[PDB]
Amino acid sequence: NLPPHIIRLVYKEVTTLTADPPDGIKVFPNEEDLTDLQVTIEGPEGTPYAGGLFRMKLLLGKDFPASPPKGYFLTKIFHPNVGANGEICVNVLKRDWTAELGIRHVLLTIKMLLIHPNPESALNEEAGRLLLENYEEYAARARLLTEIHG
């Protein structure tokens, strides 16, 4: 139940964003509810997630864009910043957020997160500790779950 003038702004972003998304990212056409966007993020090459295709959904909350969107991975993944429910915690984004950044910036931030995790704010503390204490162990399991779910 976003304000109509906000919906009018969302339709603009999504329409442009869908016709020309960032690399490795694809926003699916939404004509039902643009508050609930469906997106795929290709696992970056040179990362454990490489080769995998990760389905996610971006939810625009009630106080959007005053507050940042809330992302959720549908694809199961081993990442310090992704919870069991798939909830994505982008600590830096939520701090450096304003209404002008746009949905494109959010998706980019999530892609950058697969490359540059943040164990200082881990929803998956196991993946958080492993990333710091034994990266090779993290890369192994992350690469394994990417072969199965990616």
Residue numbers in the entry: 7 to 156
Question: Which statements did the authors publish about this structure?
Answer:
To study the Ube2S-donor ubiquitin interaction by X-ray crystallography we stably linked the active site cysteine residue of Ube2S to an engineered cysteine at the C-terminus of ubiquitin by a disulfide bond. To obtain a homogeneous disulfide-linked conjugate, we utilized a single-cysteine containing variant of Ube2S, in which the second cysteine residue, Cys 118, had been substituted by methionine. There are four Ube2S-ubiquitin conjugates in the asymmetric unit. Within each conjugate (in cis) only few contacts are formed between Ube2S and the donor ubiquitin (interface area ~ 180 Å2), resulting in an open configuration. The hydrophobic surface patch on the globular core of ubiquitin, centered about Leu 8, Ile 44, and Val 70, instead forms an interface with a neighboring E2 molecule in trans. This interface resembles the one seen in the closed NMR-derived docked complex. Notably, an ion pair between Glu 51 of Ube2S and Lys 6 of the donor ubiquitin that the docked model had predicted and that was functionally verified in charge-swap experiments is also present in the crystal structure. While the contacting surfaces in both models are quite similar in their residue composition and size (~ 590 Å2 in the crystal structure versus ~ 510 Å2 in the docked model), the donor ubiquitin molecules are pivoted by ~ 40° with respect to each other. In line with our analysis of the crystallographic lattice contacts, this indicates that the interface between Ube2S and ubiquitin that we observed in the crystal structure in trans is not dominated by other lattice contacts with neighboring molecules, but represents a low-energy state, independent of the crystal environment.
In the course of the ubiquitination cascade, ubiquitin is passed from a ubiquitin activating enzyme (E1) to a ubiquitin conjugating enzyme (E2), and finally to a target protein, as catalyzed by a ubiquitin ligase (E3). Ube2S has an inherent specificity for the formation of Lys 11-linkages, even in the absence of the APC/C. Nevertheless, the interactions between Ube2S and its ubiquitin substrates are weak and at the limit of direct experimental detection. The critical step in the formation of ubiquitin linkages is a nucleophilic substitution reaction, in which the ε-amino group of a lysine residue (or the N-terminal amino group) of an “acceptor” ubiquitin molecule attacks the C-terminal carboxyl group of a “donor” ubiquitin that is linked through a thioester bond to the active site cysteine of the E2 enzyme.
